């Protein structure tokens, strides 16, 4: 298999400031948030997946369940609740952030050694290419 379990370093980061502006978060958040770049790390035992991100600035840790509906509560980032479903179309991953907005949701996929993810929010598609450093 492809076993998502990996170490993904951040190479790029596009339209990330407008993405925070689009989600209407605070100015102090965007001041600190830009100069930073979090290193992602994926862990998956089987039908349980834990998405670990490690920054000394507010740990962004998420847990998930594949094929089973997910719910989420945020109080530090654009404090919204959405209904999210993580599934496997084929050999990729997708998430439908079912809530407000016209364009909410992320798209995942693997291009061998690099991720080609896309993140939208109110119509602003930002992208972040990572480099699997396994």
UniProtKB/Swiss-Prot annotation:
Instruction: Determine if Repressor is one of this entry's keywords.
Output: no
Q: Which GO terms describe its biological process?
A: fatty acid transport; lipid homeostasis; lipid storage; maintenance of location in cell; regulation of granulocyte differentiation; response to benzoic acid; response to retinoic acid; response to vitamin A
Q: Which InterPro entries match?
A: Calycin (IPR012674), CRBP1 (IPR031264), Fatty_acid-bd (IPR000463), ILBP (IPR031259), Lipocln_cytosolic_FA-bd_dom (IPR000566)
| Pfam families found in the cross-reference section | Lipocalin (PF00061)
Q: Which residues take part in binding all-trans-retinol?
A: 40, 62, 108
Q: Where's it found, cell-wise?
A: Cytoplasm; Lipid droplet
What are the annotated GO cellular component locations? cell body; cytosol; lipid droplet; nucleus
Residue span of region Important for interaction with STRA6: 21-31
Major localization listed first in the record, in broad terms: cytoplasm
Highest taxon, organism lineage: Eukaryota
Which terms does the record give in the GO molecular function aspect?
Answer: all-trans-retinol binding; fatty acid binding; retinal binding; retinol binding
| Keywords for the protein's UniProt record, in alphabetical order | Cytoplasm, Lipid droplet, Retinol-binding, Transport, Vitamin A
What is annotated about its quaternary structure and interactions? Interacts (only as retinol-free apoprotein) with STRA6.
Q: What is known of its domains?
A: Forms a beta-barrel structure that accommodates hydrophobic ligands in its interior.
Instruction: Tell me the protein family, please.
Output: Belongs to the calycin superfamily. Fatty-acid binding protein (FABP) family.
Q: What does this protein do?
A: Cytoplasmic retinol-binding protein. Accepts retinol from the transport protein STRA6, and thereby contributes to retinol uptake, storage and retinoid homeostasis.
Task: Kindly provide the name given to this protein in its UniProt entry.
Answer: Retinol-binding protein 1
The upper taxonomy is:
Eukaryota, Metazoa, Chordata, Craniata, Vertebrata
């Amino acid at each position: 298999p492809v076993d998502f379990n990996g170490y993904w370093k951040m190479l790029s980061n596009e339209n990330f400031e407008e993405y925070l502006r689009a989600l209407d978060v605070n100015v102090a958040l965007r001041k600190i948030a830009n100069l930073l770049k979090p290193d992602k790390e994926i862990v998956q035992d089987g039908d349980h997946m834990i998405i670990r991100t490690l920054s000394t600035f507010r740990n962004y840790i998420m847990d998930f369940q594949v094929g089973k509906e997910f719910e989420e509560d945020l109080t530090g980032i654009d404090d919204r609740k959405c209904m999210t479903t993580v599934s496997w179309d084929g050999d990729k991953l997708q998430c439908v952030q079912k809530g407000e907005k016209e364009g909410r949701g992320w798209t995942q996929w693997i291009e061998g050694d690099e991720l080609h993810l896309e993140m939208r929010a109110e119509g602003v598609t930002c992208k972040q290419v990572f480099k699997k450093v396994h």
